[PDB]
């Protein structure tokens, strides 16, 4: 019927997907066996008596994270060859991702993608989860996008990139990797959403008062954001917004599709007892600069277009009253060539809380995805770091030894500079 | 099978409930083995819980409340540091309202009875005696271990002493409070205790 295919490549994609898939299993009420004790169709398939299996592929060139999914609690939920494993890690090298190792695992992925796509027509699109800082998330993730667009042509291809932080790195060659990926995913991904580890760290600190969060605290919040986008596909709504609504309402020009996120409320148990979570308040906190998902201050940009997914007991009255308040307030500015600028989508199903998690049970929530001109800065600080260290050819002998030619480094640089100029010309 | 399958308490649970299912099937198209939701146990029997100056308190008076097990030791300095914070928290929380909300059942990891009475002389909440085998079957059930000496069936040490675990009606853990855990928030993890949702029904 309606289907979305989730692709999780690289270590960040897999471990994001583990939190992403336990939310969907819990919300539709299926056990780790895969059988519950027709909203599940977009995520879970149908096989046998009562068993549902995910419409997903897990990719990594190293075995030490997909083999350990195979041994953990959710063995039998996933199909055995939805978990494709290599032998050798890509090791922080984009050139290794394309030309050396990625040319043998991509055939296994496309076979499983095609076999999972063709069981029903009505494929709404591909969700892609990857890290542009790493090797197999950036290198092999590019190879899938080139191979997917040449065969599955006009299907929507959303992406969720864990873009590197301005200060937090855990990888010293990530200036090289995510520049090369940017030239790649610019001409394949229909809508790209930047997620930043330093952004979610400050979200977990000032909201939940979690002084020392780990990666699995981060991915729970990411899973809720993915659930809110696809909530209208799954459950009934007073005003539906599906995958196709996102691109047609947020991408005014074909190369301008890098966009932000914000989720509200993110409230622990000890603070939900004292705030009423009015529709006005949860949409006021969504536009707060310190509530963003990518660590870029939105005051130095203008919102090109905006999409607000309300989820819960949200009356359609209070959406219009609250979004009129945002449009009246003048610290938030909109660009002149988009006078009507918002999108409203309401779903009745309240968010599903994972037991033993960190959030509390709330009766309503907002997910806000904004296309802003402020994305020029998160590319510009990226732009300056690459030039400061490519100019002396440091860390290039790894890249040129594994197949790619310098000249692709230069071509990817100017393509970013072309994108840099494009944000400047459109902000007039 | 929550939170573990290899627990002595869960083994005892499965034996009695599946014996009940077999006897019912013999008396009467019924599911063998029975479902885990349909399995039922009585957790604290009549002689378990004793209040201050040794008077028996039944399981009936734990209803409609948030009940937490306090796995504690006597000479452990972390336990001695955590005790006054939880005393103040318990007192303030119970005074703040018409009805009393939380309760603490104390499970001891002390060496002997003299240490048990010396430590428990402070405490105003309920306490399980050291000789009662409940104090070790609950320990093995909720995976508490001072040191890796118990034959432990592929578990990990879920916690070290001190710990507080909010328990459900059927022995499932409502929430782990992270004092010495993955969050490592000592003496401030008590504020994360929610009590709307973790009601002992």
């Amino acid at each position: 019927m309606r289907e979305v295919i989730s692709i999780h490549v690289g270590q960040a994609g897999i471990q994001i997907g583990n939190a992403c898939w336990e939310l969907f299993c819990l919300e539709h009420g299926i056990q780790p066996d895969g059988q519950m004790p027709d909203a599940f169709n977009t995520f879970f398939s149908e096989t046998g008596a009562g068993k549902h299996v995910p419409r997903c592929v897990f990719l990594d060139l190293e075995p030490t994270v997909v083999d350990e999914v195979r041994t953990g609690t959710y063995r039998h939920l996933f199909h055995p060859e939805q978990l494709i494993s290599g032998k050798e890690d890509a090791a922080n090298n984009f050139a290794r991702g394309h030309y050396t190792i990625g040319k043998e695992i991509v055939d296994l992925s496309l076979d499983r993608i095609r076999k999972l796509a063709d069981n029903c027509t009505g494929l709404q699109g591909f969700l892609m989860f990857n890290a542009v800082g790493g090797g197999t998330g950036s290198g092999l993730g590019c190879l899938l996008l080139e191979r997917l667009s040449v065969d599955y042509g006009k299907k929507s291809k959303l992406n969720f990139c864990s873009w590197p932080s301005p200060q937090v790195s855990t990888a010293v060659v990530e200036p090289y990797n995510s520049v090369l990926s940017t030239h790649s995913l610019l001409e394949h991904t229909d809508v790209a959403v930047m997620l930043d580890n330093e952004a979610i760290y400050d979200i977990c600190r000032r909201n939940l008062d979690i002084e020392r969060p780990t990666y699995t605290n981060l991915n729970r919040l990411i899973a809720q954001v993915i659930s809110s986008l696809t909530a209208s596909l799954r459950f009934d709504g007073a005003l539906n917004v599906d995958v196709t609504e996102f691109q047609t309402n947020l991408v005014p020009y074909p190369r301008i599709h890098f966009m932000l996120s914000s989720y509200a409320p993110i409230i622990s148990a000890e603070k939900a007892y004292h705030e009423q979570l009015s529709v006005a308040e949860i949409t006021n906190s969504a536009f707060e600069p310190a509530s963003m998902m990518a660590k870029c201050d939105p005051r130095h940009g203008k919102y090109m277009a905006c999409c607000l997914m309300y989820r819960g007991d949200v009356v359609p009255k209070d959406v219009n009253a609250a979004v009129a308040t945002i449009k009246t307030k003048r610290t938030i500015q909109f660009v002149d060539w988009c006078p009507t600028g918002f999108k409203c989508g309401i779903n009745y199903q309240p968010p599903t809380v994972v037991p033993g998690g960190d959030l509390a049970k709330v009766m309503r929530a907002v997910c806000m995805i904004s296309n802003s001109t402020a994305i020029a800065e998160v590319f510009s600080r990226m732009d300056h770091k690459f030039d400061l260290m490519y100019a002396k050819r440091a860390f290039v002998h790894w890249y040129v030894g594994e197949g790619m030619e310098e000249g692709e480094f230069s071509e990817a640089r100017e393509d970013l500079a072309a994108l840099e100029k494009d944000y400047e010309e459109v902000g007039i | 099978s929550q939170p573990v399958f290899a627990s002595p308490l869960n083994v005892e649970k499965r034996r009695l409930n599946e014996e009940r299912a077999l006897m019912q099937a013999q008396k009467a198209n019924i599911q063998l083995p029975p479902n885990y939701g349909d399995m039922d146990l009585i957790l604290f029997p009549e002689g378990s819980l004793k209040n201050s100056n040794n008077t028996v308190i039944p399981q009936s008076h734990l209803k409609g409340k948030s009940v937490a097990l306090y796995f504690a030791d006597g000479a452990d300095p972390k336990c001695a540091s955590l005790l006054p914070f939880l005393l103040n928290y318990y007192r303030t929380m119970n005074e703040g309202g018409a009805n009393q909300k939380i309760e603490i059942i104390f499970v001891s990891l002390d060496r002997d009875r003299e240490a048990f009475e010396s430590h428990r002389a402070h405490m105003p909440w309920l306490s399980i005696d050291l000789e009662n085998p409940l104090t070790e079957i609950l320990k093995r059930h909720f995976r508490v271990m001072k040191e890796y000496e118990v034959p432990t069936y592929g578990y990990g040490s879920r916690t070290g002493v001190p710990s507080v675990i909010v328990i459900g009606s059927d022995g499932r853990e409502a929430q782990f409070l992270p004092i010495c855990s993955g969050l490592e928030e000592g003496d401030r993890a008590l504020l994360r205790w929610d009590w709307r949702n973790t009601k002992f029904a």
Binding site: N18, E22, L26, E27, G29, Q31, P32, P37, E68, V69, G72, T73, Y74, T214, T216, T352, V354, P355, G356 | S1, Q2, P3, Y148, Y155, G156, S157, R172, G182
Partner: peptide, 22 residues
């Protein structure tokens, strides 16, 4: 002498069989 192994992965710690909502 020897010391016993005590450690388990962070995946096995916090990705377990959660109770389903009603």
């Amino acid at each position: 002498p020897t010391l016993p192994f005590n450690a388990q992965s962070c995946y096995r710690s916090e990705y377990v069989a959660k109770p389903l909502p009603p």
